Write a protein that binds this ligand. Structure first.
Ligand SMILES: [Cu+2]
Ligand SMILES: [Cu+2]
Ligand SMILES: [Cu+2]
Ligand SMILES: [Cu+2]
Lengths: 307, 307
């Protein structure tokens, strides 16, 4: 049993943020996607004749069981067609848990809804880099060996706002065993002394993307843990350095001088010759009145009457 | 002569925002990309032996001449290979003005640097829409007819932070004459009573993109105006509606009630069971210490000495 602590898995973040224990309808969950996830399972059970308690039980079970986003593969766990067609054919972020009445693995399908899932924001120091090394940290709440990991990235055409994660959309970037190592004092995992850590060069994405992590046990039961991790690269601001023309080393003079281990934690855009704040509020109204299917076309200039 | 007023052209926004008249080194320009653009031309002239005045003249000429981002095609203006190989082969956002000593069209190459160019933010009401209708508004400061427009969009693999705009990266979405119409009272153009307005269904992009607008005169001189427009679609937040399970219509009772024409202009994420602000500041440090080429690997746990 376990989950991704870095980059934090989708269900791990929903669990740690809380607000899901009470009120039972999940209205106390601050993150909107964690809330939708919860309320989808809650409303599903309500539709299927479950009581408020069975509905709040099924939804809280999805959040609480963040170390058990699992599926059993059996002894045939290396058979890729059996994983993709039988073990986890769909509901990948839920590790294919679709039955609220049956535990394990209950119903975790709420974790597969699409929308503005909160990502791990990784900043870019150079916007031209092809890959970004990420040191993954998988938190084992229960120690299991022998085992192996599989790390996937979504294809560049994936859209987290509208799409469900599918195998046809995932690119394998890591396959193999990850040895168990002692957690660092700064570890995001607080279960036991051990973690799984590995460095993966993550292909740079210009959009929010998903990292798929499968932790598979090499054993006849074939239990595997499947977790989705929402990530985004933040671009560096300013000119791309490779285009920056630097001035020659110069020494100037004249009566007018304007002629020549801790870090830091819109009226700035106004100048003496332009009021940006006023213009940009009018420019925002322009965007609203002149974009979309309901934009102004003729009504502001055309009058009509029935003959 | 003219420029795009909606979505505002890259050079039009740099001109209207000001701060470029004084100090002459462009240090008074608030937008970082408008500043880099200016300072690239200023530093180019300085490198080529120009004085501070010739350098400040060439850079201010680029900003001031926002209605003259032009190139002459001659009588062969419908010959696409002649436009792309002879008239505007490169420096597309500058309309191929590369000579600071020669006016027209001077040097406007600063407008073709890559980086965090400020876009026109168009919000999405539905993240599943394929196209967004935009009502373009081209501001003619000088009236010319006969003429035609060409509107292009960058391919989805374009990256404004690193790439120069090329014809091999542009997709034609509009070709033809746009009739001259009376400006609306809310017009972004303040030159004369007339504007060019057209509706284009803009293919949705998940990234910041460029809109290329060519205004070509049908005449033996063959003067055309070429402008880049930086745009981005803002995604709607929350669950994708097509995945939202709604509860059945219910009427509940019990002693515990928690069991059941003008618009509006992080401690919110904390709950009674979790302190988000503290966790997320530690999570930010984790990202910094465990991503990139300088991440912590062995130094926090390994000690060495020279035998
Ligand atoms: Cu286990
Ligand atoms: Cu420092
Ligand atoms: Cu003109
Ligand atoms: Cu309203």
């Amino acid at each position: 049993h376990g989950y991704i602590t870095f980059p934090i898995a989708r269900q791990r973040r929903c669990n740690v943020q809380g607000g899901f224990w009470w009120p039972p309808d999940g209205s106390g969950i601050p993150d909107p996607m964690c809330r939708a996830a919860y309320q989808n399972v809650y409303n599903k059970v309500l539709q299927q004749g479950g009581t408020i308690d069975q509905a709040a039980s099924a939804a809280q079970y999805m959040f609480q069981q963040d170390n058990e986003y699992a599926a059993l593969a059996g002894p045939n766990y290396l058979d890729q067609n059996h994983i993709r067609n039988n073990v986890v054919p769909n509901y990948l972020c839920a590790a294919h848990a679709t039955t609220w009445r049956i535990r394990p693995f209950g119903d975790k399908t709420g974790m597969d809804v699409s929308g503005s899932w909160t990502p791990t924001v990784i900043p870019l120091q150079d916007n031209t880099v092809s890959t970004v090394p990420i040191e993954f940290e998988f938190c084992p709440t229960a120690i299991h060996e022998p085992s192996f990991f599989e790390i996937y990235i979504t294809v560049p055409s994936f859209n987290v706002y509208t799409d469900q994660v599918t195998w046809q959309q995932l690119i394998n970037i890591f396959t193999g065993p990850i040895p168990l190592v002692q957690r660092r004092p700064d570890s995001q995992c607080n279960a036991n002394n051990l973690v799984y850590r590995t460095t993966v060069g993550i292909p740079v994405r210009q959009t929010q993307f998903v990292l798929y992590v499968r932790w598979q046990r090499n054993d006849p039961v074939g239990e595997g843990f499947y977790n989705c991790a929402d990530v985004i690269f933040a671009h560096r601001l300013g000119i791309n350095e490779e285009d920056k023309i630097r001035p020659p080393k110069m020494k100037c003079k004249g009566n007018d001088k304007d002629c020549y281990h801790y870090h830091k934690c819109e009226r700035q855009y106004n100048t003496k010759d332009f009021n940006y704040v006023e213009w940009n509020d009018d420019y925002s109204d322009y965007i609203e009145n002149h974009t979309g299917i309901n934009r102004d076309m003729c009504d502001s200039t055309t009058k009509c009457c029935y003959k």
